[PDB]
């Protein structure tokens, strides 16, 4: 509360560490469905169904341009990428399986880097 603060967690490396995690996600062999925005002209249904599209390139641009206020807003956009994927793709599809693999990969790196 006013003039009463928990001890200050060092967040000065968060930008660099989120960038490294994002690089590792970008270079994973199952990243290919997620590298670029889904083409809304060419994929029927996507525009209407997925209210907030997100992809790695879009996260990378937001990161590079100071559009994440903190590391939690960054994790929310990464998770959004996988949540959208599950909303639109069957579990038993190449893309569906890619999304589950990448989420697992991300969550481990997140825990190991920050928890």
From Swiss-Prot:
Tissue note: Expressed at varying levels in several tissues, whereas a smaller transcript was expressed specifically in testis.
Cellular compartment(s): Nucleus
Superkingdom assignment: Eukaryota
Domain spans labelled Bromo: 9-113
UniProt similarity note: Belongs to the WAL family.
Subunit structure: Component of the BRF-1 ISWI chromatin remodeling complex, at least composed of SMARCA1 and BAZ2B, which regulates the spacing of histone octamers on the DNA template to facilitate access to DNA. Within the BRF-1 ISWI chromatin remodeling complex interacts with SMARCA1; the interaction is direct. Component of the BRF-5 ISWI chromatin remodeling complex, at least composed of SMARCA5/SNF2H and BAZ2B, which regulates the spacing of histone octamers on the DNA template to facilitate access to DNA.
Its job: Regulatory subunit of the ATP-dependent BRF-1 and BRF-5 ISWI chromatin remodeling complexes, which form ordered nucleosome arrays on chromatin and facilitate access to DNA during DNA-templated processes such as DNA replication, transcription, and repair. Both complexes regulate the spacing of nucleosomes along the chromatin and have the ability to slide mononucleosomes to the center of a DNA template. The BRF-1 ISWI chromatin remodeling complex has a lower ATP hydrolysis rate than the BRF-5 ISWI chromatin remodeling complex.
Protein name, UniProt field: Bromodomain adjacent to zinc finger domain protein 2B
Taxonomic source organism: Homo sapiens
Gene name as annotated: BAZ2B
């Amino acid at each position: 509360s006013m003039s009463v603060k928990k001890p200050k967690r060092d967040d000065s490396k968060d930008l660099a560490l989120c960038s490294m995690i994002l690089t590792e996600m970008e270079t994973h062999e199952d990243a290919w469905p997620f590298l670029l925005p889904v083409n809304l002209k060419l994929v029927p249904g996507y525009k209407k169904v997925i209210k907030k599209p997100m992809d790695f390139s879009t996260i990378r641009e937001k990161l590079s341009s100071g559009q994440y206020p903190n590391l939690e807003t960054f994790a929310l956009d990464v998770r959004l990428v996988f949540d959208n994927c599950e909303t639109f793709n069957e579990d038993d599809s190449d893309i569906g399986r890619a999304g589950h693999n990448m989420r697992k990969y991300f969550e481990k790196k997140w825990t190991d880097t920050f928890k």
